[PDB]
């Protein structure tokens with residue numbers, strides 16, 4: 001099985017223990033590490049932070065302790081407007097320009113492929129996402145003739161039925177990609193003034209109408225649209241989403257006033273890193289949707305929907321039973337990478353759990 005793990009750039013700036021450089025990665029933990037967020041500029045791939053050429057190297061040296069590790073660079077992400085991507089992809093001059101510039105760049109910094117995080121292609125982009133994948137791959141094949149190993153190509157696809165139906169030709173792009181990472185973590189989305197879980201595994205009996213919004217549906221759906229099981233990779237979040245409540249009603253579907261308060265280290269309304277969740281937990285009440293089999297917590301007026309070792313093992317078993325290619329984990333830097341926040345003594349507890357289950361049969 002593959003264990004694809006994202007490392008994010010802006011996580012070096014976190015103050016204190018929360019700060020994380022490629023340096024922290026167990027070279028033997030994942031199978032592919034994807035460095036997170038390259039820019040595009042002048043229709044040409046390019047660095048994003050000032051020290052990216054340094055960290056790249058830092059990351060790609062893990063391949064010195066483990067010859068089998070492959071690393072990849074991701075274009076796009078959330079601070080890269082999709083409408084930018086759109087201009088690049090719909091416009092055959094600037095598409096070739098972008099594509100053409102990707103191998104020399106990857107090769108120079110020692111990556112093994114490119115991962116495309118086009119965050120949400122729209123209805124009038126499908127034809128072109130298809131054009132960009134198809135053409136990007138074709139170029140990767142042509143560039144292997146130079147006798148080097150073929151670069152890998154992947155994409156981070158959504159998992160909302162509407163999103164899938166609007167922007168992606170799943171059948172056509174699975175034929176060209178080395179693996180699809182299903183983002184099975186952004187469910188209870190941007191909006192709802194009700195509490196809910198962002199990464200439910202299952203449907204849930206207390207949920208008659210939403211049902212397109214859990215990992216099990218997204219997966220069964222992609223399988224039905226044309227993606228082969230051995231290209232699907234299922235996103236497991238290593239962070240938690242929080243809410244500031246608006247009443248003592250703490251239970252299933254209670255009302256909300258807005259996103260939870262920021263983490264002491266992660267500093268960002270709505271998100272909590274798993275390491276902060278470990279600290280939040282002391283003096284909080286835990287509960288667990290058994291239906292969807294994922295936990296939430298509460299303390300004062302904060303309700304936190306998160307993943308712990310047990311649920312992550314669970315999702316990991318799910319994936320093997322459906323025979324997917326493996327798991328994808330959002331943010332090695334969001335997990336307890338130091339190993340000193342969450343009681344027990346493991347380094348990277350969540351990612352370890354997925355690894356352990358993936359390693360077992």
Ligand SMILES: *[C@@H]1O[C@H](CO)[C@@H](O[C@H]2O[C@H](CO)[C@@H](O[C@H]3O[C@H](CO)[C@@H](O)[C@H](O)[C@@H]3O)[C@H](O)[C@H]2NC(C)=O)[C@H](O)[C@H]1NC(C)=O
Pocket residue numbers: 039040041042047048049
């Ligand atoms: C990712 O890539 C973007 C470019 O595609 C960057 O953005 C900005 O890029 C440039 C760089 O400053 C800005 O253009 C300046 O240059 C000319 C000089 O001739 C000036 O005349 C002009 O006033 C600008 O200051 C753009 O303003 C801006 N372009 C846009 C809308 O993308 C971006 O910097 C980069 N991201 C990071 C963080 O590296």
